[PDB]
Amino acid sequence: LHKEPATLIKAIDGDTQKLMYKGQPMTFRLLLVDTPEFNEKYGPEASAFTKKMAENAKKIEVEFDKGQRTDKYGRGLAYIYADGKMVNEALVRQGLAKVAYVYKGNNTHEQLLRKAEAQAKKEKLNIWS
Template sequence: MRHKQFDGPQPYAVEAKEKVEELLKDGKVEIELGIQERDKYGRLLGYLYVDGVSLQEVLLEEGLARVAYVYNDKRHLDDYLKIEKEAKKKKKGIWSIEDYVTDKGYQMEQ
């Protein structure tokens, strides 16, 4: 199987961006800091909530994200994996494209 590079936004990237913008537009944003506050690049690590709703869970439920790059902070991991499994089962978003999501990221078959 050969894979190609993307020449623009990956599938569902625009929808994910729009969903985040929609959620952040008028709600009260809270950050639950991660166990490790920053990554090796100095980026803040944490969980976002808008009006008490987990932004990560919404993106996973709609198939606009996948569970990846979990290193130290695994407190929400089991919940996230369950949500991802349900979205995958329902073939929502990124899960609707056969063989697009792999263990190494996103790939499009050529």
């Protein structure tokens, strides 16, 4: 997989954000994770965590997997990096997302993320508290 450049247009919630990619505005949905909706427990905390990570970053990058690059809603499906650190992994490591939506063909980072989930659950963080 390869990282490609993007810039933040605006935060949306824990697992979606509006980025500019190849010069066009797109909503991205983070691969392999599911944050709570803003109206659910830890939804606000997730939204804040992703908003902070993306807004503080000097460099945002998007990395597509081997499979579908857009979902049925027209959202881009990617791993997103904020100064080289993966947002998807970070959310999971903090107990603010669960590994979820693991579809064959787009699951390159599955075991990285499951290792993070195990550590979050071991620490009883957030969702696992």
